[PDB]
Structure 1
């Protein structure tokens, strides 16, 4: 598998990937960018706080018309949300990546998530039926995710 733009030594890094997932790309991108450059332990504590409805996720690009809150203040923004489905897939891949890093022989105490990205995936289509006997699409926004952890140095 060929991953995105990664400036690290592959020997001190461990990778994970999830393709053709049925989460929303727009929320998953925010969920992923909220943990880029972080340590795995703090990220995994954060993503559970989210599900407990503390320490929200900031929405920065895909943020139109959503509501405001006060768990954005630790990031500066005033728009945030708590996307459980995206969080759960991301937690799964973090788990997988830590497993792979362990098996390659790296120390979990000082790993950080270096390169994380999501992509768009092929849509999945259904019909919805509007007034006056016409159809319109009702389709999902699936996502690929790819993720790299690596151990810190100077």
Structure 2
């Protein structure tokens, strides 16, 4: 099984998948790149805003034949769309994840999602029906969306090293000749 890059402690983290549903994988990718910075509850209240069509995630990658939108001066790119049906699938990954950390003894108020992974769901026996010779495969790709929460900053401690430097004999006598004047 395993997961992505362990940027934080996996012992204190929760996650969930949403495969074999409906909505594709790159469609929920754009909103997964803009969620990297929110604080959990900033995404829960965002779900209702989509159904009312108020905020649209900037589809910066998908630009070719992608219509603009009035909701573009929020961040920058005027080409954005609303993950409508994705909302019912995003909540599937959430909510339950908050219950997974409940049994561990944690709280879902500081553990914000920063490392979300999404792949490509498998295919089946699917063939097209076009102009005879133009028949290859009807196979497509659902989803493999999975998000992993991450705790906030707790005691960073940069810890400045001693910084070992090759000092010379004419250097230790130079510094000592400066401390007898200024210092």
CA contact (8 A) 2:25 2:145 kept: no
> Matches of 2:126 and 2:31 in 1, distance apart?
26
CA contact (8 A) 1:107 1:151 kept: no
Gap change, CA 1:148 and 1:91, over 3 Å in 2: same
> Matches of 1:37 and 1:80 in 2, distance apart?
19
CA contact (8 A) 1:58 1:79 kept: yes
Bigger proportion of residues as helix: 1
CA contact (8 A) 1:27 1:62 kept: no
Pick which of 72-81 and 138-147 moved more: 138-147
Deviations 1:114-133 (A, max 9, x none): 21021112234544433467
Deviations 1:4-43 (A, max 9, x none): 1121012332222233443212212112222123211111
Pick which of 61-70 and 128-137 moved more: 128-137
Bigger proportion of residues as strand: 1
SS in 2 for 1:42: helix
Pairing of 1:102-121 with structure 2 (within 5 A): 102-121=102-121
Q: How many residues align?
A: 154
- Ranked by relative contact order (alpha carbons within 8 Å, sequence separation 6 or more), the top structure is 1
CA contact (8 A) 1:120 1:143 kept: yes
Deviation at 1:45, TM superposition (A): 0.9
CA contact (8 A) 1:21 1:144 kept: no
> Matches of 1:41 and 1:63 in 2, distance apart?
30
What runs of 5+ residues in structure 1 fail to find an aligned partner?
A: none
Give the TM-score normalised by structure 1: 0.85
Deviations 1:76-135 (A, max 9, x none): 111111122323212210112112122222222222102102111223454443346753
Q: Which has the larger radius of gyration?
A: 2
Gap change, CA 1:136 and 1:116, over 3 Å in 2: same
Give the TM-score normalised by structure 2: 0.73
Indicate the RMSD between aligned Cα atoms, in angstroms: 2.2
2:65 match: 65
